[model samples]
Target: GLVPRGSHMLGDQVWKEVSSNTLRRPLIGVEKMINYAEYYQNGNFQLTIALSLDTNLSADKMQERLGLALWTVRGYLPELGTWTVGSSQDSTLDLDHVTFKAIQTVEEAQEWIEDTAILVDEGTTVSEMVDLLSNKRIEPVGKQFRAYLVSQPRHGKPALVMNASHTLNGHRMLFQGSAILQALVDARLTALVASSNSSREALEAVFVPEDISRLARKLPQSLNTAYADKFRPDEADVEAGFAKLGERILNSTQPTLGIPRFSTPSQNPQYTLGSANGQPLTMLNLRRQIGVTEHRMLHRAFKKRGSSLPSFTYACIVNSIDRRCKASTSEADEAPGANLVYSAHASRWFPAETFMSRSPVNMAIVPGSGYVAPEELRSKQRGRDLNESELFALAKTIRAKQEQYLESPHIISYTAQVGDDIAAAMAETANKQRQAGTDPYVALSENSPAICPPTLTSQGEVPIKNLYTPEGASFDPKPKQPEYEYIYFGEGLLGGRTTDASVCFALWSLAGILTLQAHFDSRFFDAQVIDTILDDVVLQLRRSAAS
Candidate 1:
C-alpha cells in the first residue's frame, strides 16, 4: 500500500467507476420498456383514437375535410363556380351554380384506396377501426374520458403522450350519435310490433298463477292465557315461590318444577317472604325475584361443582308445531299431523296418558289460535339473551342447525355446485405447472410465489400462470417467507414508517387485483353476488374444519 499498486490498482478503480455508472443505464432502459408495456396493456391506444374526431361535421363532410387537410384552405367559395366553359365547346357563356362533382369523386376514390390499403395490409378491419365508436355503455362520457386520461398518467408528461388524439375524438362523437340512433330504432320496432298486435286483437296476455291454499280451518278460540298487559308480580310472590320450591325439593322424591331448586335453606340468615308483610307470596312476584336469586345460586353451584360458570345462562327451546320455522305460516296447517300436540309435561295436564306416555309430555291437541301478549313475549325474549361464553355455545348450536337445514331438500340443491368452478380452475393450473416441468404440489408446499393472475376466464377454463411476472424472479421459484423476528417494526427498504409502508403495499396490491379482475370480467362487481360466493366458501371451509 505504501509503495502503491501498479496497473492492477488503476484497472480496479476504473472498473468500479464503470460498473457504478453503467448500473443506471440498464435500469433506465428497462424502465422505458415497462412504461410502454403498461401504456399499451391498459388500452391507452383506445384513448388516443377518442381524441381524434371533429364533431361539428357530418360523417361524409368529416371524411372530406380531414382528407383535404394536407393543405390549408385560405379562400371562401363565393357566387358558385366561375371557371367553366359553355356546353357548346368554348362558346362565350356564363356558367353559374355548378357543383364540383368531379373533384369530390376524385377525392373520395383516393381516400377509399388509402383506407382499403390500411385495412388489407395491416390486418385491421373496418370494425376494428370503429370499435371505439360503438355506443358508450355508461353515462357522462366527459367524466369517463377524463378518468381514462388521468388513470394512464396521473400528471401530463411528454413520455406518456400518444399520437392518435384525432381518431379518439372522432370515436367519442360517433358512439354518442350511434347510441341515440339505436334507441330510436328500438322504440320504432316496439311501436310497430304493438300496432300489429293491436290490429289483430291478439296481444299476448300473462296471467299470474295463483298459489294454492294449504291451511286447516281457523281456530275458534284463544289458546294462550299469558298476557303482557297484566301487572308485574310483587316481591312477595317471588319470596313465596322460592320458599315453596325449596320445601318441595327437600320433601318430594320427584319435583315438577321447570327450574332446579335448592334442597334446603342455608344455615346463614336467609331472606324470608317479607315477614314484615302478612300477605302470602304469589308465584308472579316469586318469578321476578328468581331472576336475581338465580345468579347467586348459579355461582354457589359452580363453586360446589369445582368449575367456572358463565356470567349468564340462556334457556332456549322451540315450542311451536314446526320447530324450525320461527313464525307460523298458513301453509303449515296443510302438513300431515298438523294437529298433533307435544308438550314438556304429560301427567300435569292430560287425563288420557296413552299418547302422553310416548314422551313424558301431554299430547292433547288444542283447537285454538295461540297468542302471547307483547309484554310476555318481550319478557321471554329478554330471558334468552346470553353472555359471551353462552353466545359462543349458541353460535355452535346455530351452525349445527344450519347444517341440518342444508341437508333438507330446500337448501341442498342450491349449494350442491359449491367450489366446483374454483376447484376445476385450480386443477387446470396444477396441470399447467406440471407440464412446464414444475411440480405444483411441491411448489405450493414450498410457498411458491406463483400467485394466480387476474384473467378473463370467460371460456370456462382456468388461467395457468400469472400474466404479469415480476422481473428477475424464476417463474416457479419459492418466495421468501417474511422473517418476523429479523424485521424491525419501523425499519427497512420501504421508507416512511414500517406500518405505513406495509399498509400501503397491502392496499396497492388489493387495488391492482380488484381493478384488474373487474376489467377482466367486464361487468359491474355486484357486492351481493360476491358475498354469496364468499359465504359458500366459508361454509365449505367450516365444514372441512369441523370434520
Candidate 2:
C-alpha cells in the first residue's frame, strides 16, 4: 500500500490544489482580454444560456443554481472519456478541464456563479460566448467551441437556460457559444403561445416585451386569427397557400428542429459540371442532416433520461398522376425516385396533415394512472413522485388512439389531398418544360425541375411520399388521439408559429395527431417524431424575417 497524507483521505487536497489554480492563471493578454470582455459582455457570441432566477430564496434555489453550474461544466466538458480529434491520448478525464473546479472553496463557487450571472445579465448572448473563447481573448483556450445545455429549477415556473461549452488544450470550459439565442427566444415565444393568458403583457412577461413587439410586426393580420379561425376558409386557404410556407412551419414547430428554412444556397446551388456522377451536395442535404442529427440527439437524450415526450410521426402515400400524358420515363424507374421525391414533397406540402389527421381522436384521462399532466405537472411535488409505469401506460394508451386516428379514412384522405397537390404541381411543371421545348426527362433526371411548375411524370402525379406517416401501417386508433393532439396542438400552438403564418399554423395544427397515428403503425416513437421534425422545414423566404 502507498503512504497517504492525512488530507488525502477524502479531500484529495494536492489534486484540488493543482486543479483549482487555472482560474488564477492570467488571461492571454490584457488588451485583448479587455476587447473580448467588452464584446463578450455585449453578447457577440453564437450560443448562450440565459437562466431566469425565480423569486424563491430557498434551498431549491441552490439546486437550480447547482444545475446551471453543473450544466456549465457539462456543456464544455465532454462526457467522461469522450474525445475529439487532435486530443491527448490519455483517455482518463480530468474533472478540472475548464479549471472551474480549480476553485475549491465555497466562496469561490459563489464568486464564479456570480460572474456567470453577470455575464448573462449584461446581455452576453450565446454567440459572444463562442467568439470570446474561440478567438482566445478569454485565454485558457483549453475550452473553445463546444455545445452545452444549462437549466435551472425555477421555484414554480419552468424557464430555459442556454448552455454551451468548448475545449482548449484538452481543458474544458463552460463557454456560452453558438447560434442558439434565436432558438431560445422562439422557445419562449412558444411557451407564451401555450399560455392561456394570450395577453400582450403576459406574452412579454414570458418572452421579452421588445421581442414580442418585433415578432408581432412580422405577422400578417391574417396570422393572428389563423389558429383561432383555422377552420375558416380564409385561414385554411392561407394555411394551405404556399407549399414552402407550410413546410417551413412543420420544421419550425419541433423542439428537435430549431427552425425551418425553405431555400438556401446549400439547397439549390448552381450545379457545376463535374467529371463523373457529379451531384452537388446542396443545402438540402445539410438541412436534412441537421434534422436527422437533431432527431437522433433528441431521441438519445430523451430515451436516456426516460422522458415520455410526445413523438413526431409521418407517413408514406401514393396517388394518381393525371389523365393525359404521352410516354415518358418507365414507372419502374420512376417509382423509387418518385417515392423519394414524394417523401420530401409531402413533407414540404402538407405540414400539418399529421395533426389534422389525429385531432378527431379523443383522449380520456385514465383512472388511477397518476399521470402528471404536462400543464399541471409543473409543481415540484409532481416531479418528486413521477409514476414511470403509469406515465408510460398513459403514453401507450394515447399512442394507440392516435394511431387509430391516423389510420382512419380522414387522415388518409388528407394524405391523398397532399398527393393530389403534389401531382398537380408536378404536372404543371412538366407541361411548362414541354412548352419551353426542353426535354422534361433530362431536367427531371438531373433533379433540377423548375420551382414554378414542379415537373411530374406523364401520369400527372408527383412522385411524393408521406414523410410524416409510416408505410404499410394502419392508422393510429381514435381513443389515443388526444395525447397526439395535446403534443402538437397544445404545445405547438402554445407559442405562436415560429415560421411564417401559413406554415406554422398548418404544421402546428397537424403534427401531433399525425405523429400519434404513425406511432401505432410503427410501434416506434423514433419513427413518429422523425418525419414531423424533418418535414417541418423553414424556408428563409425573407432574409430579414424576425427570429
Candidate 3:
C-alpha cells in the first residue's frame, strides 16, 4: 500500500495511535507553526461568511438544512474532518507527528452539527454572535466546522454562516470563504429544488425551469502533487537574509501606537463598546459595505494611477492613521515610526508547477507583512489631505516595496522569519516551564499577529454572488435572494488575551459592492475614531476616482 506515512510519537502522546482507518499526515511548517502559536493564544484563525436571507425556513427547519449543508461540505472537503493530536511543537524528526483525518459518518456528523453549530433566533446581535463564535478556542480538540443561523444579524434578517478553521484558507480567506458560501448555497439550492418546501415553491414561481444536466457539469480539480515545482531557500539565502530581517523586524515589541496592554483591560484608558461578563465576548466588529459604483470607480482610478487596490488601500490606511493621530498638531511629528502589517503570500513551498510527489502541503504560506514608513504616507501639505496624484504616488511607492518584498530572497527570508519567531516562542515556553512557571503552558500572544493590519486580505473582487440562485432564478419584483451582509475572514479573538488590530481594515468588492470592513479593538481604539478613519479612506477612494 502506497499510503503516506511518518513517525507518529511524541513522549506519552503517541501519534500513530491517532486513528486506525484514516490516512494521517505530518503537519507542515506553517500548520505546525499555527498550532504552536495557539499555545500562546488565538493563533488558530478562522473564516466565516454570513449569508442573510429572508427564506421560508424556521429556526428548526433552517437548523436541519444548515447541518446538511455542513455535512455535504464535510464529505467533499477533507480538511473539515482533519484532527491534530497536539501543538506543532510536539513533533520531532524521528517521531514525525501527524494528524488523523476521516470523514465522520452522517450520524456522527449530525451529532457534531448539534454540538458545533448554532441556531439562535432570539434577536441576538450578529456582532455579539460572531464574536462569541469567533472567540471560541479551536484546540487540538479534533477539527470541526460550525454553521450559524441568526434570526436578526446586522442586516436585520436571518443570516446563515459557514465557519471553518483557517489551516487551508490561510491566504485565500476571502476567496475560500466565498467559495464555501457558494457551496452552502449549492447545498441549500439542491435541498430547495428537490423537496416539497415553500422555498422551492417561491423559487419555482419566480424562475424558469433549471437545466439539471447542464448544472451537473462539475469543475475539474488538480490532484497531482501539491506543488508543481521545487522552489529554493538554498539555506545560504534563508539564513543570511533572515539574519538582517530578524534584527530589523519586531515580533513582540510592536510600535506602541496607543494600543492597550494585551490582557489588562484596566491598564488602558480607551472607551470600548460591548461587555464581557465572564465568558461572553467583548470584542466589537464593525463592517462597511460599498456598492458597485464606487468599487468600479476606485479600481478604474487605481488603474489610471498605475497602482493596485491593496497598495493604494494600504496608503489610505497610512493616511487614516495620520488623520487619527492628528499629526498636524505636530508639536510632535512622529517621523514615520516602523510598524508591521502582515498577510499570507505563497510560501514558495507549494508551487502548482512542481509535482515532486503526491504529498500534503498547501497550508504552508508565507505569513508576512510589510513595515509602514510614515514618510510615504505623510502629507506634503501640513494639514491637508493628499491630492489624488499624491495618494496615487504613495500607492506607487508601496507597490514597489511590495514587489521588492515578493522577490526570491525576501520571500524565503520572510518565511524563515515567521518560522524562526514561532520556534523562539516555543523555545521560550519550554524554558519558562523548565525554570518555573505557574501556568502549565504560558499563553504568549494576545491577538492575531498574522492578520495584524487587516490590510492582508483586500482580494480585489470576491466571488460571493454565487451564494444565491445561479441561472434560472428571479423574483416577481426583484429575485428573493439572500441579502448579503457582514462578511469576515481571517483571525479570531480571545476574550481579552489578545487585541485583534490596532488600526486594521480591508477593502474588497463583492458582487460590485466595495466593502470597507474595519475592526475595532475596545482596548486599543475607539469605535467612532475607527469609523471616522474608515470614512476618510472611503472618501479618499471616491475622491481619487473623481480625479
Candidate 4:
C-alpha cells in the first residue's frame, strides 16, 4: 500500500511541537545543537567525575552523607528539582519523591532520607535508581535540564556520572555543572565534619578538586536561553522562509535528496597506499581532502567503467547567532536580528568535469567578488572549473543561492513546500492505483520497474590516503558495524577558546562497505593500513602547522 501522506506530516508536526519553541528564539543555534544531541544515537555525550571517600565511613554512614549531598544540590537548581514521568515501561521510580521545592527544614531533609530508605528496602539497583532520577527526555512540557547520579564505591574509590543534554549545555560548559554538584557535596561534607569534629584530612577526602570550583565560578550567568536575545525576523517568518526554500530545492531536475555511494580499495588504487607513505592531515583538512578525493576518484572510475558519475549533496549547519561572538562586540550586542542566525550551507557536487577540477576548499568558499550569475540561470548552465580570477564566480553563485533560501521567510516556506510536494505525490500514486482496480501493493508488484525505489550502491573505500593522527579519538563507544569509523581530534583539550572538546570524536559511517575475511581477518580494512594512515596524517598536520 502507498504510504499515507498525512503520516509524513504528522512526523514533522511532532518534531516541531517538541522543538519549535527553541527554533523560534534567538537561541536557535544553540537549540539546534541540543536537538541533535537528543536525537543522534552517538550524540548522548557524557563525562565522569571520580570521587574519593573516607575509608573509615561505614556503608550506612556513606549512604546518609551521599543522600544529604544530593538533596542539597537539588534544592539549588530548579532544572534539577522536578522529575518528569517517563513511560510506564520505565524500569525504576527512584525520582518519584523529588519535588520542585526547597528543603527548608531538617524535617523536610529527613523526609528524603526516609524515602531513600524505602526505595532501598524495595531492592532497587543503584544504577536503575540513578537512571530513573537523573536521565531526562526532552519534551514539549516540563524541566529543560536533566542529570543522573550514580555512586559506586568499592573500597575507597567511587565515581559519579554527570550526563547533560548537549541541547541544554555544551560539553565544555559541563565542567560548570560538575562544579555545581561538587559544591553541593562540599557544603554537606563541611557540615558533617563540623558536627562530628572529624579530621580536616577526612573532610577533604569526600569533595572534588579545587579547580572544578574555579571553573564553575567562571561559567556564564545563566546556562539556559533566558540570557539569549530575541531574533529579528521572529519565529513565523523563519519557518515560512525554510518551507519555501525546501520546496524550491526539491523541485529541481536533480533533487538533492538521494543516497550517496563511495568507492572501495579493491575498486580504486588511491586507497592502496602502504604504511607511513603519506602525510597526515587535520580532521577538517582530511574532510576537505576526502571530498576532493571522492569527486576525483568517482569521476575517474565512472569514465573507465563507462558509467555516469552520480551527483552528491550534503549540508553543514551554521550558527547565525553566536552569543559568545555577540558578547564580545559592542555594536552588535544589542541588535535585534540574529547577528549570527541558525543557518545552513547546503552543498551539491555534480558529475561535470568543471566541478571536479575545483579544489574542495574552492568549492566550499563563496567568492568575495567574481562573475555573478542570476540564481535562476546558474543551475542550468554548463560550466568549467574556473581559473584564479574566476574562483569568486562560483562563490558569487553560491552566495546568491544561500541568500535566496537561508533567510527567515524562505527557509520556513521551503520546509512547507517539501511537505506539500510529498503529500501531492503520495496522493497521485494512490489515485493511479485506485483507477487500475488494484491496491498500491498489487500495482507495485505488477509494474515493479516503474515503482522501484532508487538505490545508490558503492564499493566502500577510504578515499583519503594515509589518514594518521595521534590527536584523533572517539567520545562515544565505537559502533560494532565494520562500515562505521570514528575519528577523534583533541578538541576538548584546547580549552574553552573553542567549543570543540578534547574528548570529541567524529563518526563516519561509510555506507555499502561489506566486510570480508580474505585479507584483514574479521575487520573491514587491514589494521596495519589504518594505523599507517593515522600515523602519517598526524605527522603531516603537525609539520604543516609548525611551518
Candidate 5:
C-alpha cells in the first residue's frame, strides 16, 4: 500500500525536520515538545485542577461562569489569549484554547477522569495525551480553549472539575490562573457562605496572592529560547557530564524493574479500606506515608545489617528569575526576566541515617512556582494532628532551600548539564543497541537500572520502590509490564488511570489538597493499605511535633 497523506505522514515529516535542523533554533518551548516526544513518548504529563464549589449553582450556570473566567484569563494573559498553528517546522505559536465539558453525575465524571486508560484500551495510540487534550484535530485554528466542568459530590462537598494538558505550559504556569478562577467562583459563593456566617476575610483568604498577571506574563518569555540562552548549559559540558553519568550507570548493577508479581495475599486485613469509609488525608500526608513506609522498609532490609542505603534524589523544576520586573519593557529587555531553573532535592529517607533523624524529615515535594509558598496546604491536614507552628516552619525551611537552589547559578547550571547528559547517554545507548540488531527501547529499559535506579530501592536486592520523575506532567507507571520489578507511581494533576498493574496519584489543588489514587492491581498498592499508612504517619508527625 502506498503511504497515505495524513497526520501520520505529517508527524513523520515534522520529526524529520526537527532532527535535520530544518527547524533551526526552534523556540525553547518547541524544543521541550520535541524532547518530550523523543524521550517520554507516553504523553503522561498533564496538569489537572479540581475546584470545590460551596455555592448552589446549576451545572449549566457553573459552566457559563467558568467559561467567562477562562476567556477573561486568556484576555489578561496575551500568550494564552491568541494561538496559531503551522504546517512548517519553525512555527512557534503553539497555544491552544481551552475546551469545556460539563458532567452531570459523579459516575460520569469518574469515567472522564479515567479516560486515558479507556482510550489506551480501545487501541487509540497517542504520543502524548497533551496533544489530544489540547487539540485532537490537526487543522490550524485560532482563539480556542478547553475545560471540562463537573458539579459532583467529592467527600460530600460539591466540586467543580477543570483540567488541562501541561504541554505548551507547565504546572506553575497553569497555576497562575487560579486566582482568576477563584475570584469568579467567590462572587457566586459569597452570599451562600455569608449566610452560613463564614468570615469574609477567611473566605477571601482561600485564594492566595490575589493577583498573578505578572507571573503569567513571565512564563511565556521563559519558554522563548532567546530568553533562556543565559541559563542553557554548553553542549560540550552537557555531553561530558552525561558521558560520565552513563559510565557510572553502565558500571552499576541493574535491578529488576516493575512490581513483584508474587501474589502474596496482604496479611493485614485492613488494607482494603476506601476513601468513603476512611478519614480524608491531604496530598502531603499521602506522600509522607509512602516516604515513611519506604524509609521503614529500607531500614528493615539494610540498616539492621549495618549496610548503608544508596542515595536517592528527586529533581524539581523551578523558574530562576523573579516576576517583579517592569511590564512596559521591550521584548528584548523582558527576555532576560524569564529563566527556567531546576533543583535536585535529596530524598531524606535514603541512606538509613536521615530516616532515623529526630529533626523533621522532608516527605512531601510540592511542585510550585518559586513565587508563592503553598499556604493553602496547612488547612488540608486530616486524620492526623501536628504542631501547626512547627509544620509551618518546616515548610518554610524547605521553601527556603528551593529558593536558595534557584539563586545558585553554579548548582543550577550543573543540574541542567547533568540532565542534558543523561538524555544524550540514553539516546546513544538506544542507537548502539539498534545498530546491534536489538530493540533499542527495550535495551534502554533493561539498562535503566544502571542509570536510573528506583528512587527508593533495597540495598543489594531487587528494587521494590521505583519512583518515576514526579515533576513532569505524566508518565505510564507500567510502560513495559511485569518485566520491570518495581511499583510505579505516576503523579500528575488530580486525574489519572488505574490499569495494567500501575498506580496513578494526582494532586488536585492547593486550596484543598484532594488526593486520588487509582490502580489495577491490589497486590501492589491498595487504598486501604495507603489509608492505614497515612494514619500512622500522621500520628507519628503529631508525636514528633509535641516533642
Candidate 6:
C-alpha cells in the first residue's frame, strides 16, 4: 500500500500507469502558480459548463452514458487523468511533473464519475451553482475533473455540469477555448444515441473513428511546443522581462489597485500582514446579458473610435474602480484616477503534440499589463455625460499596451522571468508547508501576489453552437437531441481564493446573446458599482450605434 499523504486519495494499490513515457520533471511557470493558488485556496480555477438537458434520459441514464462518453473521450487525450506526487513537496502540490492515472476501460471511467460527480439541489440557481463549483478545490492528487447533475424543475429537464481543473489539464488550450466541453458533449450524445438504437454491436463497439483515433496517437511536430518555444527568446529577452517586473515592484507609481481591507498584523506568519482579515470571504459573481444587437454596437463603438472591445471593457472596469472606491484608511493623498491593469489571453501557439503527447503544465497564457491615468481619459463634456473620447483614449492606450507586451522583443524573456519569479516564491512557501504536515484550510497569505489584474477572459463566440454533434463518429446529432437552454463559463474566484482585481469579467456569446459573466470579490466593492459600469458600457455602446 502507498504511504499516507496530504490532499485526496483512494485506498489500496495505485492504478495502472497510462503515460507513454517518463516526463521531464520541470515545473511550468503557470503550473507552479496554479498549484500555489490551490494551496492557498486562492481562485480554485475549476472550469464548469452547465448544459440544460432536453432529452428523455433520467439522472441514472444520463450519468451512465456521460461516463461512457467521458471514458471514450479520455482515450483521445489520456492526459486528462494525470496526478502528481503528494509527499514530495509541502506546497499545494508537487509542481515537478504529472503522472497519468489510466482510464483504460469504460467501466473505469464510470467508476471515476461515480466517485467525483454529484447532483446539487433543485433550488440552486445557475449562478449559485457556478459559485459552488468555482470555489471547489480539486487537490492535485484527486480526480482533476468533476461533474454536477443539477435538476431544472421548471424546464422539466436537468443540467449536466462539467468541471475541469487547470492543475490537471495543464495548459491544454481546450480550457481557453472550450474544446473539451464540446468533446464531452459530443461523446455524451454519441454514447446516448449508440445506446438508444437497437444495436448491440454499437453498444459494445469503440465509438471513436479512425480520424478521431489519430488524435490520441503522438506525432512528429508535436515536439515543437509551449509558449517559450513560440517566442524563442534569448538571454536578453529574459533580462528584459525581469527588468519590467522590477519596474512594477519598484518604479510603478500606482498601487496594485486591490482593495486593502486588512491593515492588521498577523499573529502568525501565515496570516495577512494587515490586522483585519484580508480574505475576500463572501465572493459573488453576476451575469449581465449584452444582447446580440448591443454586442454588435459594442464592437462598432470601439471600432469607430479606433479601439477594440477588449480594450473598451478593460477601460470600463478600470474606470469603475479608479475614479471611486478606497480602502478602510487612506495612507496618503493620491491622484483621483489611475489604474494598473493586467491582461491574460490564451495564446494557442503551442504544437499539437505538446497537448497530446506531453502535459504543458498550465503556461499557455501570454500576460500583459498597463497603467491608465486620468489625464489620458480627459473628457470634453466635463460632468454632463462622460464623453466617448475618454473611453476611446483609455481603450486605445490599453490595446497599445497589450500590443507592446504581446510583441515585446523580450516576450520569452518576460514570460520566463515572470514564471521563474513565481516559481521562486512558490518554492519559499512549499518549504514551509512541507514540514507543517498540512496546509491550513482557514488561513490567508500576505505573500501570494494576485495572478492577474481583474481578469478579462472572453470566449468570444462559442464555436460549438450545437453540443450534440461529436467530431469522431457518424451519427444524427439532431436526433432526439437535448436543447441547450443556457450556458455558463468561469473560474472560482471567491469560493477558494481572494484575487487582486475586484472582478474577473468573463465575456462570451452563446448562440447569439453576449453574456458578461463577472466573478467579483464582494468583500472589496459592492455589486452596484459593477452593475453601473456594465450599464454605462452598454449605454455608451448604444449611443455610439445611434450616432
Task: Please write out the lDDT profile of model 1 over residues 1-547, one tens digit for every residue.
Answer: 6874321221112111112111000101111222222221222112212122112223332222221211111001110111111222466321111111111233443433233112112233222222322111111111122111111222221010111211112112222222222221233323433454331121112112111111000100000100001112245634543443343233222211111112221223232222223421110101101122433444355344332222111111211111222222223432111111011111122233222111111111111111221222122343323233333343244333223322311111111122233333444554565687753223222221111111111111111121111121112322334321010000001011100000000000110111001111101122232233233323322232233
Model 1's alpha-carbon lDDT is 0.20
CA lDDT scores, all candidates in order: 0.20, 0.23, 0.46, 0.27, 0.30, 0.47
TM-score, structure 2 vs. true = 0.21
How does each model score on TM-score? 0.15, 0.21, 0.68, 0.31, 0.39, 0.70
Which candidate ranks first by TM-score, i.e. highest? 6
* Winner of 3 and 4 under lDDT: 3
Off by over 4 Å in 4: 1-66, 84-159, 165-176, 181-189, 196-229, 232-540
Q: How accurate is candidate 4 locally (lDDT)?
A: 0.27
Candidate that scores best on lDDT: 6
Question: Residue 300 of candidate 2: its Cα lDDT?
Answer: 50
lDDT string for model 2 (1-547, tens) is: 5874322121111111222232111111111222222222221121222222222223333222332333233222322112112222487422222122333344444444443432222333333332222221222222333322222222222223332222111101111211122122233333443463423333234321112212211111111122222333353444443333343334222212011122222223342111123442110101122233343444354345443233111111110111011111222422111111111111222233211112110001100001112222112345312233433333344334333322311121122234344434544565576688754223232332111110111011122111111111112322243221110001100111000101111121111211111101111112223234333322110111111
If the candidates were sorted by their TM-score against the true structure, best first, what order would they fall in? 6, 3, 5, 4, 2, 1
Question: In terms of TM-score, how similar is model 1 to the real structure?
Answer: 0.15
Decoy 5 TM-score against native: 0.39
Ten residues in sequence with the least summed lDDT for candidate 5? 312-321
Better of 2 and 5 by lDDT: 5
Off by over 4 Å in 5: 1-40, 78-146, 152-155, 167-219, 223-407, 414-493, 496-509, 512-536
* Segments in model 6 whose C-alpha atoms lie over 4 Å from true places: 1-25, 52-61, 89-93, 103-110, 116-125, 139-142, 151-157, 168-225, 247-281, 326-337, 346-363, 378-386, 424-459, 465-502, 524-528
Which candidate, 5 or 6, would have the higher lDDT against the true structure? 6
> In model 1, which runs have C-alpha deviations exceeding 4 angstroms?
1-31, 34-56, 70-518, 521-547
What's the true lDDT of residue 395 in model 1?
27
